[PDB]
Ligand binder design. Structure first.
Ligand SMILES: O=C(O)CNC(=O)C(=O)O
Ligand SMILES: [Mg+2]
Ligand code: NI
Ligand SMILES: [Zn+2]
Length: 331
């Protein structure tokens, strides 16, 4: 069995190997990459996402989100307070202001320490979930706006033709902006490219151990757990590495830098934070190996998780027994 300790693997494809996305994902899995829940892919030196970022300040962040924490430093939730619209140029200036900027630090480890010590005492503003792409249309390799769609994968594997679309999303971050512990919708893959700026630190639980994280989360967030049998779908709960280690939860960590891709694998729980002003692009995707995970994915029906249009068909086809309850939670 490849990668039996479920370590995060780092890949360096050549330009030739970068041509066929599906084939490379399957290669990484042949080497056991999925067992970690997360892999890093460093593009060949010949590749570029676009020519320059010199012209992005006019993108609008219609609904910036202030991430307000509650709890203790290592076990907290965050809620998103909506803020007035601002441009990326305005958001970058805010990120760099004395109130929001990255503090002086020695190295990524020192900054990680400071994040977990101090996160709860601040409320950083995240420009998350913005439909759009920064890949040049002429970038042919690993262009996250030109991937095969999840609807086409389901149709190819299962024969069923469904409505829905699959487009990328932009994320503009600042120091301490946080992504809570989650798996993807319908336990899909994700791919994330860090276009520019400061790093992103990731934490991940191997898919084979995801239920250990769920059981800890029920213990740590007991009111939330009574409210919903899949409350991690709400994407609000944080648990620090120190708390994970105290409770014996297997996990790994890695820091993504500008120019690098990360892939999350089906049912790989992940969480993390941004080091400073940055911009990432991410999209969900599927492969044949996903179908079994999609059929078994938990679902929130309490009303909180509220998701895209395209998830309806995935539930309807892969999970018909659950469909009526889940759709009530959507409505
Ligand atoms: O970058 C972020 O804030 C969150 N991204 C993801 O959870 C992902 O790419 O799957
Ligand atoms: Mg612009
Ligand atoms: Ni994710
Ligand atoms: Zn719920």
């Amino acid at each position: 069995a490849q990668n039996p300790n479920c370590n995060i693997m780092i890949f360096h494809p050549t330009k030739e190997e970068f041509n066929d996305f599906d084939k490379y994902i399957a290669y990484m899995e042949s080497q056991g990459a999925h067992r970690a829940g997360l892999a890093k892919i460093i593009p060949p030196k010949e590749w570029k996402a676009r020519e320059t970022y010199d012209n992005i300040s006019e993108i609008l962040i219609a609904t910036p989100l202030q991430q307000v924490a509650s709890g203790r430093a290592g076990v907290f939730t965050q809620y998103h307070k909506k803020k007035k619209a601002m441009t990326v140029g305005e958001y970058r200036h805010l990120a760099n202001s004395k109130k929001y900027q990255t503090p002086p630090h020695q190295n990524f480890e020192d900054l990680e320490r400071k994040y977990w010590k101090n996160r709860i005492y601040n409320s950083p503003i995240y420009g998350a979930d913005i439909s759009g792409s920064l890949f040049d249309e002429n970038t042919k390799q690993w262009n996250l706006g030109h991937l095969g769609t999840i609807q086409d994968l389901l149709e190819k594997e299962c024969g069923v033709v469904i409505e829905g679309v699959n487009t990328p999303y932009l994320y503009f971050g600042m120091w301490k902006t946080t992504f809570a512990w989650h798996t993807e919708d319908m336990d899909l893959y994700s791919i994330n490219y860090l276009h520019l700026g400061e790093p992103k630190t990731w934490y991940v639980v191997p898919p084979e151990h995801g239920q250990r994280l769920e059981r800890l989360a029920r213990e740590l967030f007991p009111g939330s757990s009574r409210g919903c049998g899949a409350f991690l779908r709400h994407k609000v709960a944080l648990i620090s590495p120190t708390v994970l280690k105290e409770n014996g939860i297997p996990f790994n960590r890695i820091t993504q830098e500008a120019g690098e891709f990360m892939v999350t694998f089906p049912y790989g729980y992940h969480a993390g934070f941004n080091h400073g002003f940055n911009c990432a692009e991410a999209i969900n995707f599927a492969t044949p190996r996903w179908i079994d995970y999609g059929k078994m994915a938990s679902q929130c029906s309490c009303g909180e998780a509220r998701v895209t249009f395209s998830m309806d068909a995935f539930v309807r086809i892969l999970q018909p027994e659950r469909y009526d309850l889940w759709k009530r939670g959507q409505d």
